[PDB]
Design an enzyme around this catalytic site. Structure first.
Site, PDB file in Angstrom:
ATOM      1  N   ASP A  34      30.913  17.722  60.592  1.00  0.00           N
ATOM      2  CA  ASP A  34      29.561  17.339  60.143  1.00  0.00           C
ATOM      3  C   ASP A  34      29.011  16.154  60.920  1.00  0.00           C
ATOM      4  O   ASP A  34      29.388  15.015  60.667  1.00  0.00           O
ATOM      5  CB  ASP A  34      29.591  16.979  58.644  1.00  0.00           C
ATOM      6  CG  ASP A  34      28.299  16.300  58.146  1.00  0.00           C
ATOM      7  OD1 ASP A  34      27.257  16.410  58.798  1.00  0.00           O
ATOM      8  OD2 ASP A  34      28.310  15.659  57.084  1.00  0.00           O
ATOM      9  N   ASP A 220      22.464  18.096  63.482  1.00  0.00           N
ATOM     10  CA  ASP A 220      23.309  18.058  62.281  1.00  0.00           C
ATOM     11  C   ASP A 220      24.089  19.349  62.003  1.00  0.00           C
ATOM     12  O   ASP A 220      23.533  20.331  61.493  1.00  0.00           O
ATOM     13  CB  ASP A 220      22.435  17.690  61.079  1.00  0.00           C
ATOM     14  CG  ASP A 220      23.174  17.726  59.771  1.00  0.00           C
ATOM     15  OD1 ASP A 220      24.422  17.888  59.752  1.00  0.00           O
ATOM     16  OD2 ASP A 220      22.486  17.586  58.735  1.00  0.00           O
TER      17      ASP A 220
HETATM   18  C1  RTH Z   1      27.926  19.960  52.882  1.00  0.00           C
HETATM   19  C2  RTH Z   1      27.234  20.218  51.528  1.00  0.00           C
HETATM   20  C3  RTH Z   1      25.782  20.605  51.789  1.00  0.00           C
HETATM   21  C4  RTH Z   1      27.997  21.276  50.718  1.00  0.00           C
HETATM   22  C5  RTH Z   1      27.273  18.965  50.726  1.00  0.00           C
HETATM   23  C6  RTH Z   1      27.314  17.916  50.018  1.00  0.00           C
HETATM   24  C7  RTH Z   1      27.349  16.693  49.256  1.00  0.00           C
HETATM   25  C8  RTH Z   1      27.555  16.628  47.873  1.00  0.00           C
HETATM   26  C9  RTH Z   1      27.577  15.377  47.248  1.00  0.00           C
HETATM   27  C10 RTH Z   1      27.403  14.210  47.998  1.00  0.00           C
HETATM   28  C11 RTH Z   1      27.206  14.269  49.381  1.00  0.00           C
HETATM   29  C12 RTH Z   1      27.178  15.522  50.010  1.00  0.00           C
HETATM   30  C13 RTH Z   1      26.967  15.662  51.391  1.00  0.00           C
HETATM   31  C14 RTH Z   1      27.916  15.236  52.312  1.00  0.00           C
HETATM   32  C15 RTH Z   1      27.672  15.408  53.674  1.00  0.00           C
HETATM   33  C16 RTH Z   1      26.503  16.007  54.124  1.00  0.00           C
HETATM   34  N1  RTH Z   1      26.287  16.162  55.447  1.00  0.00           N
HETATM   35  C17 RTH Z   1      25.144  16.722  55.910  1.00  0.00           C
HETATM   36  N2  RTH Z   1      24.963  16.861  57.222  1.00  0.00           N
HETATM   37  C18 RTH Z   1      24.160  17.170  55.022  1.00  0.00           C
HETATM   38  C19 RTH Z   1      24.373  17.026  53.649  1.00  0.00           C
HETATM   39  C20 RTH Z   1      25.557  16.438  53.199  1.00  0.00           C
HETATM   40  C21 RTH Z   1      25.786  16.249  51.849  1.00  0.00           C
END
Ligand code: RTH
Length: 371
Positions: A34, A220
């Site tokens: 990510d 991203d």
């Molecule tokens: C990867 C998924 C979309 C399943 C998720 C989540 C999540 C849940 C609770 C707190 C934070 C996140 C979180 C963590 C990383 C992330 N990275 C990104 N590029 C976009 C969004 C993101 C969101």
């Protein structure tokens, strides 16, 4: 780098994951790649959805930092305790390093039921690391503690069951055709870049380019969709709707509120327009353009129905898988820039192709940035 080729697995569109080991002896975990965040965080507790999780008790190299961390999202959250330990990548370089690790101990809507990954590897910069910028991200630690060059590149192939390559520390020239073109990184927090011009079927959207990067444009891997700020999305879909008038579709589909279904073997891609994003080039007044096909933005869901993989955002432009699955993406952290080349594995019909073409002339590129 044959060692690292094909070291990513995944499901559409649950994201891409790489195999990692943590602790002594090594504990193996699938970790989501990510580039949209900066934390290395893993499940540490037996959540029902996980195939496995970090058992700190088994690791003699584990060090408690006695600090908790709370990451809220739009709705849902993850929560854990901070520590360090010895991290390695079996299908990556041949080194072991000591990295910060957030042991996830409470989450909501974070882990996906049915997925095959147990944590996240935030590949971006310290400024956006939760809780604060002192918490050195994984990649800064690899580069600080070894001779591994300060860069990585990603080839995400577009097909349950998707694959790809994360080349840590270099570029594998066999993964792409033509030439790399580089966009500078505006700021080291996210991989923030400036978009200077949008075309659909090579027809300008003619908007003040400040709108394309409001408040942000980023590259991203953690996001599936091409996400555009609302004005931009409005004008983009309005333009796509027009360009694709051979067949009509319900008004909800374009908002991604329903699916759209055709008979097996019969999809007509040519009804659909190529999307061009021009990105700030390396030199004053010089830009380049990247070009994606509908195979990138109309993505099949298997539960043939495709979903419109372009949606609106309030967080800015997000160039997710939709964009990245067309291109070999080089994250050249050593030179503050990001490189794009036509991916060797990208999904294409016989008529068209994903393109990286340049150079073009574009004035006032730096004014497309938001302040
Ligand atoms: C990867 C998924 C979309 C399943 C998720 C989540 C999540 C849940 C609770 C707190 C934070 C996140 C979180 C963590 C990383 C992330 N990275 C990104 N590029 C976009 C969004 C993101 C969101």
């Amino acid at each position: 780098f044959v060692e690292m080729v094909d070291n990513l697995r995944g499901k559409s569109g649950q994201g891409y994951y790489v195999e990692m080991t943590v602790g002594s002896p090594p504990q193996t975990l699938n970790i989501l790649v990510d580039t949209g965040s900066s934390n290395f965080a893993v499940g540490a507790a037996p959540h029902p959805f996980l195939h496995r999780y970090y058992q700190r008790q088994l690791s003699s190299t584990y060090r408690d930092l006695r600090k908790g961390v709370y990451v809220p999202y739009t709705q849902g959250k993850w929560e854990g305790e901070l520590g360090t330990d010895l991290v390695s990548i079996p299908h990556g370089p041949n080194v072991t390093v000591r990295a910060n690790i957030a042991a996830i101990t409470e989450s909501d809507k974070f882990f996906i039921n049915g997925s095959n990954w147990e944590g996240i590897l935030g590949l971006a910069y310290a400024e956006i690391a939760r809780p604060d910028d002192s918490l050195e991200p994984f990649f800064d630690s690899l580069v600080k503690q070894t001779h591994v060059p300060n860069l990585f590149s990603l080839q995400l192939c577009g097909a349950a069951s998707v694959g790809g390559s994360m080349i840590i520390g270099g570029i594998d020239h066999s993964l792409y055709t033509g030439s790399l073109w580089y966009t500078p990184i505006r700021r080291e927090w996210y991989y923030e870049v400036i978009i200077v011009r949008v075309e659909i079927n090579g027809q300008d959207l003619k908007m003040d380019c400040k709108e394309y990067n409001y408040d942000k444009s980023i590259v991203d891997s953690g996001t599936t969709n091409l996400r555009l700020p609302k004005k931009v999305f409005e004008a983009a879909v309005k333009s796509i709707k027009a360009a694709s008038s051979t067949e009509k579709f319900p008004d909800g589909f374009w908002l991604g509120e329903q699916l759209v279904c055709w008979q097996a073997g019969t999809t007509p891609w040519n009804i659909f327009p190529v999307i061009s994003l021009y990105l700030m080039g390396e030199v004053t007044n010089q830009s380049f353009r990247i070009t994606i096909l509908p195979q990138q933005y109309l993505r099949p869901v298997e539960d043939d129905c495709y979903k419109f993989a372009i949606s609106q955002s309030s967080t800015g432009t997000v160039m997710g898988a939709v964009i990245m699955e067309g291109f070999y993406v080089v994250f050249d952290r050593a030179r503050k820039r990001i490189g794009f080349a036509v991916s060797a594995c990208h999904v294409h019909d016989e008529f068209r192709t994903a393109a990286v073409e340049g150079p073009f002339v574009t004035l006032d590129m730096e004014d497309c940035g938001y302040n």
